[PDB]
Design an enzyme around this catalytic site. Structure first.
Site, PDB file in Angstrom:
ATOM      1  CG  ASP A 197      -1.636   1.225   1.255  1.00  0.00           C
ATOM      2  OD1 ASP A 197      -1.440   2.278   2.246  1.00  0.00           O
ATOM      3  OD2 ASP A 197      -2.712   1.537   0.559  1.00  0.00           O
ATOM      4  CD  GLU A 233      -1.862   2.699  -3.992  1.00  0.00           C
ATOM      5  OE1 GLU A 233      -3.017   3.503  -4.438  1.00  0.00           O
ATOM      6  OE2 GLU A 233      -1.445   2.660  -2.899  1.00  0.00           O
TER       7      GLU A 233
HETATM    8  O1  LIG Z   1      -6.884  10.774   9.421  1.00  0.00           O
HETATM    9  C1  LIG Z   1      -6.300  10.723   8.208  1.00  0.00           C
HETATM   10  C2  LIG Z   1      -6.924  10.983   7.084  1.00  0.00           C
HETATM   11  O2  LIG Z   1      -7.994  10.041   7.052  1.00  0.00           O
HETATM   12  C3  LIG Z   1      -8.887   9.807   5.858  1.00  0.00           C
HETATM   13  O3  LIG Z   1      -8.020   9.582   4.720  1.00  0.00           O
HETATM   14  C4  LIG Z   1      -8.213   8.406   4.004  1.00  0.00           C
HETATM   15  C5  LIG Z   1      -8.744   8.678   2.422  1.00  0.00           C
HETATM   16  O4  LIG Z   1      -9.575   9.498   2.437  1.00  0.00           O
HETATM   17  C6  LIG Z   1      -8.695   7.274   1.715  1.00  0.00           C
HETATM   18  O5  LIG Z   1      -8.771   7.482   0.415  1.00  0.00           O
HETATM   19  C7  LIG Z   1      -7.578   6.189   2.011  1.00  0.00           C
HETATM   20  O6  LIG Z   1      -6.489   6.368   1.268  1.00  0.00           O
HETATM   21  C8  LIG Z   1      -5.650   5.244   0.955  1.00  0.00           C
HETATM   22  C9  LIG Z   1      -5.934   3.959   0.054  1.00  0.00           C
HETATM   23  O7  LIG Z   1      -7.229   2.735   0.086  1.00  0.00           O
HETATM   24  C10 LIG Z   1      -4.647   2.924  -0.357  1.00  0.00           C
HETATM   25  O8  LIG Z   1      -4.741   2.336  -1.824  1.00  0.00           O
HETATM   26  C11 LIG Z   1      -3.288   3.810  -0.503  1.00  0.00           C
HETATM   27  O9  LIG Z   1      -3.435   4.480  -2.013  1.00  0.00           O
HETATM   28  O10 LIG Z   1      -2.961   4.666   0.655  1.00  0.00           O
HETATM   29  C12 LIG Z   1      -4.280   5.604   1.341  1.00  0.00           C
HETATM   30  C13 LIG Z   1      -3.550   5.325   2.445  1.00  0.00           C
HETATM   31  O11 LIG Z   1      -2.996   3.943   3.008  1.00  0.00           O
HETATM   32  O12 LIG Z   1      -7.377   6.207   3.641  1.00  0.00           O
HETATM   33  C14 LIG Z   1      -7.134   7.584   4.174  1.00  0.00           C
HETATM   34  C15 LIG Z   1      -6.743   7.290   5.671  1.00  0.00           C
HETATM   35  O13 LIG Z   1      -7.636   6.552   6.335  1.00  0.00           O
HETATM   36  C16 LIG Z   1      -9.428  11.062   5.586  1.00  0.00           C
HETATM   37  O14 LIG Z   1     -10.181  11.139   4.328  1.00  0.00           O
HETATM   38  C17 LIG Z   1      -8.573  12.530   5.676  1.00  0.00           C
HETATM   39  O15 LIG Z   1      -9.373  13.750   5.695  1.00  0.00           O
HETATM   40  C18 LIG Z   1      -7.680  12.276   7.167  1.00  0.00           C
HETATM   41  O16 LIG Z   1      -6.730  13.404   6.983  1.00  0.00           O
HETATM   42 CL   LIG Z   2      -4.415  -0.998  -5.800  1.00  0.00          CL
END
Ligand SMILES: OC[C@H]1O[C@H](O[C@H]2[C@H](O)[C@@H](O)[C@@H](O[C@H]3[C@H](O)[C@@H](O)[C@@H](O)O[C@@H]3CO)O[C@@H]2CO)[C@H](O)[C@@H](O)[C@@H]1O
Ligand SMILES: [Cl-]
Ligand SMILES: OC[C@H]1O[C@H](O[C@H]2[C@H](O)[C@@H](O)[C@@H](O[C@H]3[C@H](O)[C@@H](O)[C@H](O)O[C@@H]3CO)O[C@@H]2CO)[C@H](O)[C@@H](O)[C@@H]1O
Ligand SMILES: OC[C@H]1O[C@H](O[C@H]2[C@H](O)[C@@H](O)[C@H](O)O[C@@H]2CO)[C@H](O)[C@@H](O)[C@@H]1O
Ligand SMILES: OC[C@H]1O[C@@H](O)[C@H](O)[C@@H](O)[C@@H]1O
Ligand SMILES: [Ca+2]
Ligand SMILES: [Cl-]
Length: 496
Positions: A197, A233
């Site tokens: 990830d 990723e």
């Molecule tokens: O409090 C931290 C942060 O949390 C929330 O962010 C989330 C995103 O909205 C969400 O897209 C997701 O992002 C991930 C993916 O599924 C994964 O493929 C890879 O691409 O990385 C990202 C992290 O591993 O998760 C985050 C975290 O929960 C929230 O929306 C924010 O406002 C907040 O700042």
């Molecule tokens: Cl992916």
């Protein structure tokens, strides 16, 4: 790593996004095994923070608080049971490994976590690991906010917080080793490999140093000397500072160009036409096939402001979606991952879905079981695309033609195209707004073949369209632009 380590001749994996371990175990036995699926990408199996605002979003699972195998998908016993039962019917498990970060730096201290572990995010305390402040990148990041402010600067992107997420100090052997210990426990349990990830947000060399610590796969199920499959990723659509190729040394990489470009083509946006797909693959500037993990959509961008934006095709656009997935599964480029989703209530304000947070089907936060209906669809608002005839039969297609070259391309200069795989399969698409009616060279032995899009071979019959192939390998395909599925596919094992 580069080898998927699927059972020989099984050529796809499926993302069973937010499925519970016990449901996946059953699905392996009743379906994925018999229907020739290579394996399952599972959601992150390690403990995450509970998010109550909004109520239990899918993305809470990307905020680790420990490496306990203890989530809404199930506990360690259940996880082990799933890996065992799936491996025993020849279906592999690949773990979504969330290793760049722990939870949000702004989260409250306490035991609001999926296994009840304590953490204090503000003080960078994760005693269930254990991590402390020494184990995060706070001092190394040079931006005023401590967050990523510009993706033009690779240092920011790697050393600073991604949307507020506490950024692990992946330079340190202590941290590398803590992560390795987690991954190695999973491998010994019988996992075949890992989605890494958020790989963009780590240095290639740091990832390498973790991977170098990993066990060979469990010889209960794998040949001695087997290295875990690694796909990282990295979203790289081109024209940015960090490139996919930076990660080739570690394993495969997600080719996000794949679904973005293909969606745009199949939607016929931006002047794009299916006939342009003749040199699909490297010819479109993609990474090498033997480095690529490919897919039409993933769990992020199916919600429609990820990599690819609104061009990404999803189960919401079922007709065109099956066309794109069919093309992908027929074409030799890349190792293919099929998406499997749940429905949620979309609500587009100004062309953003403000409901894009909604987590899996649940009763009061408890994830619903996957029920199977008589027609082999699922209930409880699991979409189960991987059970759609048009997709599952193309998963089988890819198995059947494994190793056979791209051959016998045809197009009408617009949006009707065809091609084959050696002498073992052939597929024909009409994505134009008029009739397809052509006699094409299939590359196949003369005979009568069941179309596996409209139907199946059952005994010595077809349930759907039949394709009569001449001695010389030609056949007529007639496909109306108003056909429910405007494409036909035949292969060696659908021959009567
Ligand atoms: O409090 C931290 C942060 O949390 C929330 O962010 C989330 C995103 O909205 C969400 O897209 C997701 O992002 C991930 C993916 O599924 C994964 O493929 C890879 O691409 O990385 C990202 C992290 O591993 O998760 C985050 C975290 O929960 C929230 O929306 C924010 O406002 C907040 O700042
Ligand atoms: Cl992916
Ligand atoms: O090879 C690197 C590039 O590969 C991809 O380019 C695609 C185009 O996006 C697509 O339009 C098509 O180009 C055709 C073009 O539209 C048309 O005017 C011309 O007459 O024929 C072209 C060939 O069919 O196909 C190419 C790939 O061949 C990719 O999208 C791009 O970002 C890469 O730079
Ligand atoms: O094998 C199960 C059924 O798969 C398809 O049905 C899909 C349909 O193609 C898709 O457009 C829609 O969104 O989902 C359904 C499944 O819920 C076949 O078309 C059916 O004949 C099969 O029974
Ligand atoms: O091996 C990868 C290394 O790349 C360097 O450029 C970074 O500054 C280090 O933090 C990292 O450990
Ligand atoms: Ca980082
Ligand atoms: Cl590096």
């Amino acid at each position: 790593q580069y080898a998927p380590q699927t059972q020989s001749g099984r050529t796809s994996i499926v993302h069973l996004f937010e499925w519970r371990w016990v449901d996946i175990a059953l699905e392996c036995e009743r379906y994925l095994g018999p229907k020739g699926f290579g394996g399952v990408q599972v959601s992150p199996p390690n403990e995450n923070i509970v998010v109550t605002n909004p109520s239990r979003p899918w993305w809470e699972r990307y905020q680790p608080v420990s490496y306990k195998l203890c989530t809404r998908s199930g506990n360690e016993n259940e996880f082990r049971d799933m890996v065992t039962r799936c491996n025993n019917v020849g279906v592999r498990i690949y773990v979504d490994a969330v290793i760049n970060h722990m939870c949000g730096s702004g989260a409250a201290a306490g035991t609001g976590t999926t296994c009840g572990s304590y953490c204090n995010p503000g003080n960078r305390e994760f005693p269930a690991v254990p991590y402390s402040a020494w184990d995060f990148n706070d001092g190394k990041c040079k931006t005023a906010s401590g967050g990523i402010e510009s993706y033009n600067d690779p240092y920011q992107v790697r050393d600073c917080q991604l949307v507020g997420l506490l950024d692990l100090a992946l330079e340190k052997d202590y941290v590398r080793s803590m992560i390795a210990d987690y991954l190695n426990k999973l491998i010994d349990i019988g996992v075949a490999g890992f989605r890494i990830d958020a790989s963009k947000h780590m240095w290639p060399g740091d990832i390498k140093a973790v991977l170098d610590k990993l066990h060979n796969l469990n010889t209960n199920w794998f040949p001695a000397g087997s290295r875990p499959f690694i796909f990282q990723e990295v979203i790289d659509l081109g024209g940015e500072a960090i490139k996919s190729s930076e990660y080739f040394g570690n394993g495969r990489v997600t080719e996000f160009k794949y679904g973005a470009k293909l969606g745009t083509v199949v939607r016929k946006w931006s002047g794009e036409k299916m006939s342009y797909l003749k040199n699909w693959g490297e010819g479109w500037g993609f990474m090498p096939s033997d480095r690529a993990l490919v897919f039409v959509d993933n769990h992020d961008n199916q919600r429609g402001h990820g990599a690819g934006g609104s061009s990404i095709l999803t189960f919401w656009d079922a007709r065109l979606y099956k066309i794109a997935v069919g093309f992908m599964l027929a074409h030799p480029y890349g190792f293919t991952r099929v998406m499997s989703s749940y429905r949620w209530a979309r609500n587009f304000v100004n062309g953003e879905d403000v409901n894009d947070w909604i987590g899996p089907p649940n009763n009061n936060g408890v994830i619903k079981e996957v029920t199977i209906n008589a027609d082999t669809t699922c209930g409880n608002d699991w979409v189960c695309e991987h059970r759609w005839r048009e997709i599952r039969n193309m998963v089988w297609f890819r198995n059947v033609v494994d190793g056979q070259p791209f051959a016998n391309w045809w197009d009408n200069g617009s949006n009707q195209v065809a091609f084959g795989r050696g002498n073992r399969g052939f597929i024909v698409f009409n994505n134009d707004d008029w009739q397809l009616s052509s006699t094409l060279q299939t590359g196949l032995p003369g005979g009568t073949y069941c179309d596996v899009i409209s139907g199946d071979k059952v005994g010595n019959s077809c349930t759907g369209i039949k394709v009569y192939v001449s001695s010389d390998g030609t056949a007529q395909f007639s496909i109306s632009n108003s056909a429910e599925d405007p494409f036909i596919a035949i292969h060696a094992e659908s021959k009567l």
